[PDB]
PDB file of C-alpha atoms and ligand atoms in Angstrom:
ATOM      1  CA  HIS A   1     -61.084-133.711 143.859  1.00 40.16           C
ATOM      2  CA  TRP A   2     -62.548-136.021 146.568  1.00 39.60           C
ATOM      3  CA  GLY A   3     -65.543-138.206 147.282  1.00 41.74           C
ATOM      4  CA  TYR A   4     -66.698-141.598 148.510  1.00 42.85           C
ATOM      5  CA  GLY A   5     -66.661-143.610 145.252  1.00 42.83           C
ATOM      6  CA  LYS A   6     -64.252-146.343 144.123  1.00 45.36           C
ATOM      7  CA  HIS A   7     -62.159-143.757 142.248  1.00 44.16           C
ATOM      8  CA  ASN A   8     -61.976-140.820 144.594  1.00 41.92           C
ATOM      9  CA  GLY A   9     -62.975-142.374 148.017  1.00 47.15           C
ATOM     10  CA  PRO A  10     -61.127-142.681 151.358  1.00 46.52           C
ATOM     11  CA  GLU A  11     -58.395-144.955 150.029  1.00 47.42           C
ATOM     12  CA  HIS A  12     -57.375-142.223 147.560  1.00 48.38           C
ATOM     13  CA  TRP A  13     -57.419-139.271 149.906  1.00 49.39           C
ATOM     14  CA  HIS A  14     -53.855-139.571 151.135  1.00 52.09           C
ATOM     15  CA  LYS A  15     -52.499-138.565 147.715  1.00 51.92           C
ATOM     16  CA  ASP A  16     -53.729-134.938 147.930  1.00 52.21           C
ATOM     17  CA  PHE A  17     -53.965-134.964 151.771  1.00 51.43           C
ATOM     18  CA  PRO A  18     -50.955-136.948 153.119  1.00 49.43           C
ATOM     19  CA  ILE A  19     -52.103-136.379 156.726  1.00 46.88           C
ATOM     20  CA  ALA A  20     -54.686-139.132 155.862  1.00 46.28           C
ATOM     21  CA  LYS A  21     -52.041-141.553 157.125  1.00 43.15           C
ATOM     22  CA  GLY A  22     -51.170-139.458 160.164  1.00 47.56           C
ATOM     23  CA  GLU A  23     -50.949-140.222 163.848  1.00 45.21           C
ATOM     24  CA  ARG A  24     -54.275-138.841 165.077  1.00 45.81           C
ATOM     25  CA  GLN A  25     -56.806-139.615 162.237  1.00 43.88           C
ATOM     26  CA  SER A  26     -60.571-140.110 162.712  1.00 43.57           C
ATOM     27  CA  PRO A  27     -62.817-141.844 162.934  1.00 46.60           C
ATOM     28  CA  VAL A  28     -61.809-144.863 165.090  1.00 44.41           C
ATOM     29  CA  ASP A  29     -63.364-147.963 166.547  1.00 47.07           C
ATOM     30  CA  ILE A  30     -64.294-147.402 170.180  1.00 48.29           C
ATOM     31  CA  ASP A  31     -63.456-150.619 172.003  1.00 48.49           C
ATOM     32  CA  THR A  32     -65.698-150.353 175.070  1.00 50.98           C
ATOM     33  CA  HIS A  33     -63.442-152.752 177.030  1.00 50.57           C
ATOM     34  CA  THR A  34     -60.361-150.633 176.431  1.00 53.01           C
ATOM     35  CA  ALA A  35     -61.842-147.179 177.200  1.00 52.78           C
ATOM     36  CA  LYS A  36     -61.245-146.267 180.843  1.00 53.17           C
ATOM     37  CA  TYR A  37     -63.599-144.096 182.924  1.00 55.47           C
ATOM     38  CA  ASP A  38     -61.761-140.812 183.722  1.00 56.74           C
ATOM     39  CA  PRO A  39     -63.083-139.279 186.925  1.00 56.04           C
ATOM     40  CA  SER A  40     -61.277-136.011 186.277  1.00 55.53           C
ATOM     41  CA  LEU A  41     -63.427-135.231 183.278  1.00 54.80           C
ATOM     42  CA  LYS A  42     -65.411-132.064 184.185  1.00 55.58           C
ATOM     43  CA  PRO A  43     -69.132-132.138 183.488  1.00 58.05           C
ATOM     44  CA  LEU A  44     -70.023-131.565 179.654  1.00 59.03           C
ATOM     45  CA  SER A  45     -71.989-128.386 178.988  1.00 57.94           C
ATOM     46  CA  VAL A  46     -73.987-128.047 175.807  1.00 57.88           C
ATOM     47  CA  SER A  47     -75.384-124.492 175.626  1.00 57.92           C
ATOM     48  CA  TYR A  48     -77.531-124.199 172.521  1.00 57.65           C
ATOM     49  CA  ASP A  49     -80.300-121.802 173.802  1.00 61.45           C
ATOM     50  CA  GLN A  50     -79.355-118.894 171.461  1.00 58.61           C
ATOM     51  CA  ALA A  51     -78.273-120.910 168.419  1.00 57.13           C
ATOM     52  CA  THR A  52     -78.707-119.069 165.193  1.00 58.16           C
ATOM     53  CA  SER A  53     -78.800-121.418 162.171  1.00 59.78           C
ATOM     54  CA  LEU A  54     -78.227-119.625 158.727  1.00 59.60           C
ATOM     55  CA  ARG A  55     -78.571-122.043 155.826  1.00 58.04           C
ATOM     56  CA  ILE A  56     -78.470-125.694 154.682  1.00 54.97           C
ATOM     57  CA  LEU A  57     -76.183-126.647 151.795  1.00 54.65           C
ATOM     58  CA  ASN A  58     -75.659-129.847 149.698  1.00 55.08           C
ATOM     59  CA  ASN A  59     -71.854-129.656 149.137  1.00 55.27           C
ATOM     60  CA  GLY A  60     -71.745-132.783 146.905  1.00 54.43           C
ATOM     61  CA  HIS A  61     -70.293-134.764 149.844  1.00 49.94           C
ATOM     62  CA  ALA A  62     -73.107-134.469 152.430  1.00 49.28           C
ATOM     63  CA  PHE A  63     -75.243-131.557 153.655  1.00 48.73           C
ATOM     64  CA  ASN A  64     -74.282-128.920 156.195  1.00 49.42           C
ATOM     65  CA  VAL A  65     -76.431-126.803 158.419  1.00 46.86           C
ATOM     66  CA  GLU A  66     -74.446-123.572 158.987  1.00 44.51           C
ATOM     67  CA  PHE A  67     -74.628-121.331 162.047  1.00 45.47           C
ATOM     68  CA  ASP A  68     -73.837-117.746 162.988  1.00 48.06           C
ATOM     69  CA  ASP A  69     -70.646-118.117 164.984  1.00 47.14           C
ATOM     70  CA  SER A  70     -69.914-114.331 165.346  1.00 47.89           C
ATOM     71  CA  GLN A  71     -70.441-114.497 169.139  1.00 47.22           C
ATOM     72  CA  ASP A  72     -70.847-117.071 172.023  1.00 49.55           C
ATOM     73  CA  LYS A  73     -74.475-118.000 171.015  1.00 48.87           C
ATOM     74  CA  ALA A  74     -74.285-121.819 170.826  1.00 51.77           C
ATOM     75  CA  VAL A  75     -71.250-123.199 172.684  1.00 49.37           C
ATOM     76  CA  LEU A  76     -69.765-126.460 174.036  1.00 53.90           C
ATOM     77  CA  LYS A  77     -67.729-126.369 177.235  1.00 54.50           C
ATOM     78  CA  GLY A  78     -66.589-128.752 179.985  1.00 53.74           C
ATOM     79  CA  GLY A  79     -65.889-132.433 179.697  1.00 55.41           C
ATOM     80  CA  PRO A  80     -62.448-132.788 178.261  1.00 58.79           C
ATOM     81  CA  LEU A  81     -62.388-129.188 176.923  1.00 60.03           C
ATOM     82  CA  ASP A  82     -60.523-126.112 178.170  1.00 62.51           C
ATOM     83  CA  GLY A  83     -62.306-122.967 177.284  1.00 63.57           C
ATOM     84  CA  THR A  84     -65.208-122.278 175.016  1.00 62.01           C
ATOM     85  CA  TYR A  85     -66.031-123.761 171.584  1.00 59.86           C
ATOM     86  CA  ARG A  86     -68.508-122.096 169.262  1.00 61.46           C
ATOM     87  CA  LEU A  87     -70.925-124.141 167.047  1.00 62.47           C
ATOM     88  CA  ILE A  88     -70.224-123.507 163.342  1.00 62.27           C
ATOM     89  CA  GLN A  89     -72.133-126.325 161.622  1.00 62.76           C
ATOM     90  CA  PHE A  90     -73.624-129.740 161.765  1.00 60.84           C
ATOM     91  CA  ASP A  91     -73.573-132.492 159.211  1.00 61.15           C
ATOM     92  CA  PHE A  92     -74.267-136.173 158.855  1.00 61.37           C
ATOM     93  CA  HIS A  93     -72.800-139.271 157.374  1.00 62.65           C
ATOM     94  CA  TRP A  94     -75.057-142.233 156.389  1.00 62.18           C
ATOM     95  CA  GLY A  95     -75.333-145.511 154.604  1.00 60.60           C
ATOM     96  CA  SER A  96     -77.066-147.117 151.625  1.00 63.88           C
ATOM     97  CA  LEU A  97     -78.685-149.624 154.096  1.00 64.35           C
ATOM     98  CA  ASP A  98     -79.196-149.501 157.866  1.00 62.04           C
ATOM     99  CA  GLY A  99     -76.203-151.664 158.780  1.00 58.02           C
ATOM    100  CA  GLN A 100     -73.608-149.090 157.798  1.00 58.57           C
ATOM    101  CA  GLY A 101     -73.260-145.361 157.707  1.00 58.79           C
ATOM    102  CA  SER A 102     -71.523-144.228 160.933  1.00 59.02           C
ATOM    103  CA  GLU A 103     -67.833-143.193 160.891  1.00 57.94           C
ATOM    104  CA  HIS A 104     -67.000-144.132 164.474  1.00 59.47           C
ATOM    105  CA  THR A 105     -67.936-147.706 165.455  1.00 60.22           C
ATOM    106  CA  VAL A 106     -68.480-149.194 168.850  1.00 57.97           C
ATOM    107  CA  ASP A 107     -67.000-152.610 169.371  1.00 56.76           C
ATOM    108  CA  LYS A 108     -66.977-152.780 165.513  1.00 57.86           C
ATOM    109  CA  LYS A 109     -70.761-151.981 165.379  1.00 56.00           C
ATOM    110  CA  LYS A 110     -71.645-149.592 162.521  1.00 55.96           C
ATOM    111  CA  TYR A 111     -74.740-147.432 163.125  1.00 55.97           C
ATOM    112  CA  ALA A 112     -77.053-146.251 160.355  1.00 56.27           C
ATOM    113  CA  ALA A 113     -75.635-142.740 160.449  1.00 57.05           C
ATOM    114  CA  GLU A 114     -73.615-140.282 162.555  1.00 60.14           C
ATOM    115  CA  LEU A 115     -74.301-136.600 163.201  1.00 60.78           C
ATOM    116  CA  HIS A 116     -71.409-134.163 163.900  1.00 63.16           C
ATOM    117  CA  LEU A 117     -71.870-130.874 165.635  1.00 65.09           C
ATOM    118  CA  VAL A 118     -68.625-128.978 164.827  1.00 68.10           C
ATOM    119  CA  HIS A 119     -67.262-126.271 167.127  1.00 70.53           C
ATOM    120  CA  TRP A 120     -64.175-124.134 167.178  1.00 70.46           C
ATOM    121  CA  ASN A 121     -62.094-122.837 170.055  1.00 70.49           C
ATOM    122  CA  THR A 122     -62.849-119.154 170.652  1.00 73.36           C
ATOM    123  CA  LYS A 123     -59.236-118.589 171.873  1.00 77.63           C
ATOM    124  CA  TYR A 124     -58.115-118.670 168.211  1.00 78.32           C
ATOM    125  CA  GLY A 125     -60.603-116.059 166.937  1.00 77.19           C
ATOM    126  CA  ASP A 126     -61.908-117.799 163.834  1.00 74.55           C
ATOM    127  CA  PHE A 127     -62.370-121.290 162.390  1.00 71.54           C
ATOM    128  CA  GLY A 128     -59.534-120.971 159.856  1.00 69.95           C
ATOM    129  CA  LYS A 129     -57.022-120.147 162.614  1.00 67.57           C
ATOM    130  CA  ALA A 130     -58.516-122.854 164.944  1.00 70.03           C
ATOM    131  CA  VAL A 131     -57.737-125.527 162.315  1.00 68.13           C
ATOM    132  CA  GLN A 132     -54.064-124.668 162.587  1.00 71.00           C
ATOM    133  CA  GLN A 133     -54.132-125.742 166.311  1.00 73.94           C
ATOM    134  CA  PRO A 134     -54.088-129.228 167.918  1.00 74.23           C
ATOM    135  CA  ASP A 135     -56.947-128.104 170.227  1.00 71.62           C
ATOM    136  CA  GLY A 136     -58.726-125.945 167.644  1.00 74.46           C
ATOM    137  CA  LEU A 137     -61.980-127.992 167.189  1.00 71.61           C
ATOM    138  CA  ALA A 138     -64.425-130.013 169.265  1.00 70.31           C
ATOM    139  CA  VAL A 139     -66.862-132.268 167.441  1.00 70.30           C
ATOM    140  CA  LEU A 140     -69.841-133.763 169.234  1.00 71.40           C
ATOM    141  CA  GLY A 141     -70.666-136.996 167.507  1.00 68.85           C
ATOM    142  CA  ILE A 142     -74.035-138.675 167.836  1.00 68.95           C
ATOM    143  CA  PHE A 143     -75.038-142.092 166.404  1.00 72.26           C
ATOM    144  CA  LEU A 144     -78.344-142.695 164.700  1.00 71.36           C
ATOM    145  CA  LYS A 145     -80.209-146.000 164.747  1.00 70.49           C
ATOM    146  CA  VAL A 146     -83.475-146.735 162.954  1.00 69.07           C
ATOM    147  CA  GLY A 147     -86.582-146.985 165.158  1.00 70.56           C
ATOM    148  CA  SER A 148     -89.035-144.277 166.105  1.00 69.72           C
ATOM    149  CA  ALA A 149     -88.933-140.950 164.344  1.00 68.26           C
ATOM    150  CA  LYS A 150     -86.833-138.109 165.767  1.00 67.80           C
ATOM    151  CA  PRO A 151     -89.180-135.113 165.855  1.00 67.33           C
ATOM    152  CA  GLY A 152     -86.362-132.613 166.067  1.00 66.51           C
ATOM    153  CA  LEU A 153     -84.806-133.953 162.819  1.00 66.53           C
ATOM    154  CA  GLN A 154     -87.964-133.661 160.787  1.00 64.49           C
ATOM    155  CA  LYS A 155     -87.371-129.959 159.795  1.00 61.95           C
ATOM    156  CA  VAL A 156     -84.091-131.131 158.224  1.00 64.66           C
ATOM    157  CA  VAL A 157     -85.726-134.071 156.358  1.00 63.60           C
ATOM    158  CA  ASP A 158     -88.447-131.933 154.862  1.00 62.16           C
ATOM    159  CA  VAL A 159     -85.995-129.375 153.401  1.00 60.28           C
ATOM    160  CA  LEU A 160     -83.900-131.989 151.633  1.00 60.24           C
ATOM    161  CA  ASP A 161     -86.118-132.040 148.488  1.00 57.71           C
ATOM    162  CA  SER A 162     -85.008-128.396 147.873  1.00 58.95           C
ATOM    163  CA  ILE A 163     -81.292-129.147 147.964  1.00 56.91           C
ATOM    164  CA  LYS A 164     -81.176-132.450 146.047  1.00 56.72           C
ATOM    165  CA  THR A 165     -77.983-131.723 144.064  1.00 54.91           C
ATOM    166  CA  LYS A 166     -74.540-130.417 144.699  1.00 54.07           C
ATOM    167  CA  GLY A 167     -74.367-126.662 145.107  1.00 54.25           C
ATOM    168  CA  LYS A 168     -77.908-126.176 146.129  1.00 56.13           C
ATOM    169  CA  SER A 169     -78.690-124.335 149.372  1.00 57.53           C
ATOM    170  CA  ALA A 170     -81.779-123.172 151.257  1.00 60.18           C
ATOM    171  CA  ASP A 171     -82.653-120.813 154.083  1.00 59.96           C
ATOM    172  CA  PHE A 172     -82.537-122.726 157.303  1.00 58.66           C
ATOM    173  CA  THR A 173     -83.073-120.223 159.993  1.00 59.94           C
ATOM    174  CA  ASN A 174     -84.606-120.819 163.443  1.00 57.87           C
ATOM    175  CA  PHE A 175     -83.550-124.464 163.641  1.00 58.65           C
ATOM    176  CA  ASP A 176     -82.933-125.666 167.199  1.00 60.60           C
ATOM    177  CA  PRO A 177     -80.114-128.165 167.341  1.00 61.85           C
ATOM    178  CA  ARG A 178     -81.131-129.186 170.909  1.00 63.87           C
ATOM    179  CA  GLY A 179     -83.741-131.359 169.231  1.00 64.24           C
ATOM    180  CA  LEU A 180     -80.987-133.639 167.826  1.00 65.92           C
ATOM    181  CA  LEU A 181     -79.597-134.781 171.187  1.00 66.98           C
ATOM    182  CA  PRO A 182     -80.337-138.025 173.020  1.00 67.19           C
ATOM    183  CA  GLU A 183     -81.271-138.008 176.743  1.00 68.50           C
ATOM    184  CA  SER A 184     -77.828-138.886 178.037  1.00 69.53           C
ATOM    185  CA  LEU A 185     -74.580-136.901 177.615  1.00 68.33           C
ATOM    186  CA  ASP A 186     -72.498-139.966 178.642  1.00 66.67           C
ATOM    187  CA  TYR A 187     -69.516-139.921 176.145  1.00 64.88           C
ATOM    188  CA  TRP A 188     -66.210-141.192 174.974  1.00 67.70           C
ATOM    189  CA  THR A 189     -63.429-138.769 174.114  1.00 66.24           C
ATOM    190  CA  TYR A 190     -60.141-138.948 172.294  1.00 65.56           C
ATOM    191  CA  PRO A 191     -57.941-136.586 170.173  1.00 67.75           C
ATOM    192  CA  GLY A 192     -58.401-136.946 166.431  1.00 64.41           C
ATOM    193  CA  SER A 193     -59.043-135.221 163.179  1.00 60.04           C
ATOM    194  CA  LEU A 194     -61.681-134.088 160.691  1.00 61.04           C
ATOM    195  CA  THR A 195     -63.046-137.193 158.940  1.00 57.79           C
ATOM    196  CA  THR A 196     -63.318-135.254 155.586  1.00 60.52           C
ATOM    197  CA  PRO A 197     -60.479-133.701 153.610  1.00 61.39           C
ATOM    198  CA  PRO A 198     -58.464-131.792 154.607  1.00 62.55           C
ATOM    199  CA  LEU A 199     -58.399-134.279 157.498  1.00 64.51           C
ATOM    200  CA  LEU A 200     -56.801-131.759 159.849  1.00 65.39           C
ATOM    201  CA  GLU A 201     -55.626-133.083 163.147  1.00 65.58           C
ATOM    202  CA  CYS A 202     -57.318-130.464 165.330  1.00 64.29           C
ATOM    203  CA  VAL A 203     -60.303-132.198 166.904  1.00 63.59           C
ATOM    204  CA  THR A 204     -61.221-133.212 170.396  1.00 63.24           C
ATOM    205  CA  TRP A 205     -63.861-135.864 169.728  1.00 62.86           C
ATOM    206  CA  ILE A 206     -66.748-136.253 172.096  1.00 62.38           C
ATOM    207  CA  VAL A 207     -68.843-139.200 170.962  1.00 59.46           C
ATOM    208  CA  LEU A 208     -72.130-139.746 172.821  1.00 56.24           C
ATOM    209  CA  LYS A 209     -72.793-143.259 173.993  1.00 58.37           C
ATOM    210  CA  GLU A 210     -76.575-143.166 173.544  1.00 58.24           C
ATOM    211  CA  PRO A 211     -77.724-143.136 169.873  1.00 61.95           C
ATOM    212  CA  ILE A 212     -80.759-141.212 168.782  1.00 63.57           C
ATOM    213  CA  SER A 213     -83.480-143.098 166.985  1.00 61.54           C
ATOM    214  CA  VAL A 214     -84.713-141.864 163.578  1.00 63.98           C
ATOM    215  CA  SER A 215     -87.442-143.473 161.482  1.00 65.38           C
ATOM    216  CA  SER A 216     -86.855-145.558 158.386  1.00 70.86           C
ATOM    217  CA  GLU A 217     -88.748-142.791 156.426  1.00 67.04           C
ATOM    218  CA  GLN A 218     -86.359-140.099 157.748  1.00 66.32           C
ATOM    219  CA  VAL A 219     -83.242-141.986 156.782  1.00 65.24           C
ATOM    220  CA  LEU A 220     -84.736-142.963 153.410  1.00 66.21           C
ATOM    221  CA  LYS A 221     -85.022-139.230 152.621  1.00 65.35           C
ATOM    222  CA  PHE A 222     -81.309-138.659 153.314  1.00 63.92           C
ATOM    223  CA  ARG A 223     -80.612-141.406 150.720  1.00 60.46           C
ATOM    224  CA  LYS A 224     -82.564-139.546 148.035  1.00 60.90           C
ATOM    225  CA  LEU A 225     -80.029-136.691 147.953  1.00 61.94           C
ATOM    226  CA  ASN A 226     -77.490-136.657 145.140  1.00 62.52           C
ATOM    227  CA  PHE A 227     -73.696-136.337 145.041  1.00 64.31           C
ATOM    228  CA  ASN A 228     -73.987-134.943 141.496  1.00 67.85           C
ATOM    229  CA  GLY A 229     -74.900-131.540 140.365  1.00 67.09           C
ATOM    230  CA  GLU A 230     -78.238-130.408 138.655  1.00 66.19           C
ATOM    231  CA  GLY A 231     -78.958-132.094 135.396  1.00 65.07           C
ATOM    232  CA  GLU A 232     -75.829-134.496 135.663  1.00 68.20           C
ATOM    233  CA  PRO A 233     -76.108-138.477 135.866  1.00 70.54           C
ATOM    234  CA  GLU A 234     -77.798-139.315 139.199  1.00 68.85           C
ATOM    235  CA  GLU A 235     -75.470-140.747 141.800  1.00 72.60           C
ATOM    236  CA  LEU A 236     -77.348-141.153 145.066  1.00 71.54           C
ATOM    237  CA  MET A 237     -75.658-139.573 148.128  1.00 72.76           C
ATOM    238  CA  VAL A 238     -75.144-142.677 150.261  1.00 75.08           C
ATOM    239  CA  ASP A 239     -72.202-144.277 152.067  1.00 76.64           C
ATOM    240  CA  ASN A 240     -70.530-140.960 152.616  1.00 74.01           C
ATOM    241  CA  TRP A 241     -68.564-142.259 155.592  1.00 73.63           C
ATOM    242  CA  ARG A 242     -64.855-142.722 156.189  1.00 74.58           C
ATOM    243  CA  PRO A 243     -64.016-146.093 157.825  1.00 76.08           C
ATOM    244  CA  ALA A 244     -62.216-146.451 161.111  1.00 76.61           C
ATOM    245  CA  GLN A 245     -58.554-145.440 161.137  1.00 77.09           C
ATOM    246  CA  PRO A 246     -55.650-146.725 163.238  1.00 74.51           C
ATOM    247  CA  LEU A 247     -55.828-145.721 166.872  1.00 72.15           C
ATOM    248  CA  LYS A 248     -51.987-145.479 167.058  1.00 75.84           C
ATOM    249  CA  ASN A 249     -50.829-144.155 170.521  1.00 77.76           C
ATOM    250  CA  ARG A 250     -54.162-142.883 171.596  1.00 73.52           C
ATOM    251  CA  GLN A 251     -56.349-143.281 174.630  1.00 72.88           C
ATOM    252  CA  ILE A 252     -60.183-143.250 174.546  1.00 72.89           C
ATOM    253  CA  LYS A 253     -61.589-142.020 177.806  1.00 74.24           C
ATOM    254  CA  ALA A 254     -65.156-142.697 179.124  1.00 72.76           C
ATOM    255  CA  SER A 255     -67.122-140.072 180.978  1.00 68.84           C
ATOM    256  CA  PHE A 256     -69.235-142.728 182.788  1.00 69.33           C
ATOM    257  CA  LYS A 257     -68.791-145.908 184.846  1.00 68.23           C
TER     258      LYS A 257
HETATM  259  O1  LIG B   1     -68.054-133.827 158.012  1.00 67.02           O
HETATM  260  N1  LIG B   1     -67.541-132.564 158.264  1.00 67.02           N
HETATM  261  C1  LIG B   1     -67.499-131.584 157.238  1.00 67.02           C
HETATM  262  C2  LIG B   1     -66.870-130.358 157.475  1.00 67.02           C
HETATM  263  C3  LIG B   1     -66.219-130.130 158.706  1.00 67.02           C
HETATM  264  C4  LIG B   1     -66.424-131.019 159.773  1.00 67.02           C
HETATM  265  C5  LIG B   1     -67.090-132.255 159.538  1.00 67.02           C
HETATM  266  S1  LIG B   1     -67.404-133.329 160.823  1.00 67.02           S
HETATM  267 ZN1  LIG B   2     -68.991-134.693 159.723  1.00 63.38          ZN
END
C-alpha cells in the first residue's frame, strides 16, 4: 500500500488515490507576501482543558496520539471555523536531518518537523461522516524548529522506545496537548486536504505562524522509530512528509497584520 520511499512514496499515491492530483490538496507553500490579513476572521479558540488522550500507536507511517472524542472535551472553534470541531488525534511529520521534515513550508522554508492536531466537525456526528464533507475537518498545524527542549513534548519522546515498530501501541493517557502549543495563535488558513492517503479534501487548515522549539535530542528520538514491523529489516522512520502541492485557485488568509 503506501509510504514515503522511492517505490511507494508521494509520487505514487495518485494511482490508488486519484484525488492526489485534485484541486484542494495539502500541504502547500505559504507565500507570506501573497497571504492577506483577513479582519473578519473571528478569534481562534483552542479549548483543551478536558482532553482525554487514549493511546499512542506506530502505524508504520508515523505515530498517532489518539483521543476520546465521544463528547466536546477538547475542541477547536473560532477563527475561520463555523461550529465546533472535536480533537481526535495528533501526529507528526519529520525529517532525516533538521533542514527538512515539515509538510507546509513558509516562503519555501522547510522546518524540522510539523505537528498536526486533527479535529472533526461535530455537526456530522462522527469522523467517518465528517470526511465526506468539504468542511468536515480542521487541522491545527504547528512547525517545529531545533533549539531548546519542549517540556510538554518530552512525555511523547520517552514513550517512543516502546512503540519502535509498526503495529505497536502503548497506553498514553493523561497527556495534555496544551503543552505542544507556542505562545502565539497567529495563523494562516486555507482549504485543503489530508496530507496522507486517502488525501480527502475535507480540511480547513490553520497553520500557526510561530514554531515551537524542540531539542536536537528530542528530534533524534523521533528518528529512531521504524517504518517496518517487529523483527523485519530496519528502515528508520524519517522523511515521512508529503511535499508542497499546487495551490490552484486558493487563497491563504492571515489572522494577523
Ligand atoms: O497525518 N495524519 C494522519 C491521519 C489523519 C490526519 C493526519 S494530519
Ligand atoms: Zn499529519
